Enzyme design. Structure first.
Site, short mmCIF file in Angstrom:
data_model
loop_
_atom_site.label_atom_id
_atom_site.label_comp_id
_atom_site.label_asym_id
_atom_site.label_seq_id
_atom_site.Cartn_x
_atom_site.Cartn_y
_atom_site.Cartn_z
N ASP A 1 3.95 14.49 11.94
CA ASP A 1 3.56 14.70 11.05
C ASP A 1 2.80 14.22 10.53
O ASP A 1 2.03 14.03 9.21
CB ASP A 1 4.40 12.81 10.41
CG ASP A 1 4.69 13.40 8.40
OD1 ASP A 1 4.79 13.87 7.81
OD2 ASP A 1 5.38 12.10 7.65
N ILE B 1 0.64 -0.93 0.28
CA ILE B 1 -0.06 0.16 0.12
C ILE B 1 1.10 1.41 -0.03
O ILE B 1 0.05 2.03 -1.07
CB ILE B 1 -1.24 -0.10 1.39
CG1 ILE B 1 -1.86 -1.51 1.31
CG2 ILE B 1 -2.32 1.32 1.59
CD1 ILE B 1 -2.71 -1.76 2.44
N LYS C 1 1.89 -3.03 9.00
CA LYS C 1 3.08 -2.17 8.60
C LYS C 1 3.50 -2.73 9.69
O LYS C 1 4.12 -3.86 10.27
CB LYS C 1 2.65 -1.27 10.08
CG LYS C 1 3.46 0.20 9.38
CD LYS C 1 3.20 1.31 9.97
CE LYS C 1 1.93 1.92 9.80
NZ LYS C 1 1.04 2.74 10.81
N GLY D 1 5.74 4.18 5.23
CA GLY D 1 5.43 4.59 6.19
C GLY D 1 6.85 4.98 6.83
O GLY D 1 8.34 4.27 6.75
N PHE E 1 7.28 3.32 10.39
CA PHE E 1 7.50 2.68 10.35
C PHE E 1 8.13 1.10 9.60
O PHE E 1 8.93 0.15 9.92
CB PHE E 1 6.54 1.40 11.19
CG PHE E 1 6.66 0.30 12.26
CD1 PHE E 1 6.89 0.49 13.13
CD2 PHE E 1 6.04 -0.31 11.52
CE1 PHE E 1 7.73 -0.61 13.94
CE2 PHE E 1 6.47 -1.62 12.41
CZ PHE E 1 6.92 -1.63 14.02
N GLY E 2 7.69 1.49 8.83
CA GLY E 2 7.91 0.72 7.57
C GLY E 2 6.95 0.32 5.89
O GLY E 2 5.59 1.79 5.98
#
Length: 290
Positions: A141, A21, A43, A24, A26-27
């Protein structure tokens, strides 16, 4: 309650991490499905935003305790074989960014009453974070891709990989970063409020914050729109797709709020609690445009 998942369970649920998708803090995030058929966003670990078991444990205790109708809830986690994984419900209507000027915006227009309800819900989620009992949580963010939409188009602030309880480097997202950050070296609640001010201008204008493909005077949404707001020429910045679909006073009060969020010096920006109250009054006014 929050569920612990084995790395094997996540493998079946994501079908070998086939459907990506995005990426981010975290990954990378993958699409998945739990045994009960619940659609999830998975995630997984990013090397730069991971350390070890002890650090992931406090982040996990925080995310589990954050519960609010306008925040994406954490459904589960996996910490096994050095893989750190966070599992969230899948938001089927995507991000606010997508609906404003992504691919869905090509097919259909987000009407102004839905936009105003999204701004209020996002502001309520952010206020809950800033007033979180014990220690305020800064999102750090805030941006329109981090406002997700459920099946009834209710807003849910997402993606707390950069979040933390209240070094100089690149922070935020281009177009949303507190203009004082390199002078203070700290992001605060009022940095989040500035970023939300940009989101409000995206909602009003239908435009992304930065676009070099526009004429140079229009490259930056904030710099372009601010003189029209201050010059009582607000209709010049409103998204053409919602022109005529808004109560004049509701729109004026929204851009007045946006303008105060965008103040260059943090102490002049309103709190998120004050922004919620202004958006609530604006929503009432809009609903009474009978």
């Amino acid at each position: 309650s929050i569920q612990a998942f084995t790395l094997e369970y996540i493998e079946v649920a994501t079908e070998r991490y086939k459907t990506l998708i995005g990426e981010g803090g975290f990954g990378s995030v993958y699409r998945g499905t739990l045994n009960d058929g619940q659609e999830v966003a998975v995630k997984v670990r990013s090397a730069t935003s991971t350390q070890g078991t002890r650090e992931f444990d406090n982040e996990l205790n925080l995310l589990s305790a954050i519960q609010h109708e306008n925040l994406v809830p954490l459904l589960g986690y996996c910490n096994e074989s050095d893989q750190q994984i966070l599992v969230y419900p899948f938001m089927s209507n995507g991000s606010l960014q997508d609906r404003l000027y992504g691919e869905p915006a090509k097919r259909k227009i987000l009407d102004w009453p839905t936009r105003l309800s999204i701004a209020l819900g996002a502001a309520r989620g952010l206020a809950y974070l800033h007033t979180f009992p014990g220690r305020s949580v800064i999102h750090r963010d805030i941006k329109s891709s981090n406002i997700l939409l459920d099946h009834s188009m209710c807003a849910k602030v997402a993606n707390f990989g950069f979040s933390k309880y209240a070094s100089l480097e690149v922070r935020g997202t281009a177009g949303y970063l507190d203009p004082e950050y390199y002078k203070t070296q700290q992001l605060s609640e009022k940095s989040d409020v500035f970023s939300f001010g940009v989101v409000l201008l995206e909602i009003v204008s239908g435009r992304e914050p930065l676009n070099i493909k526009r004429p140079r005077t229009e490259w930056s949404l904030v710099e372009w729109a601010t003189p029209y707001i201050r010059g009582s020429k607000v209709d010049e910045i409103v998204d053409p797709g919602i022109k005529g679909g808004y109560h004049a006073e509701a729109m004026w009060r929204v851009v007045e709020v946006a303008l105060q969020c965008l103040e260059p010096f943090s102490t002049y920006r309103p709190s998120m609690v004050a922004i919620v109250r202004e958006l609530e009054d604006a929503l009432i006014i809009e609903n009474n445009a009978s």
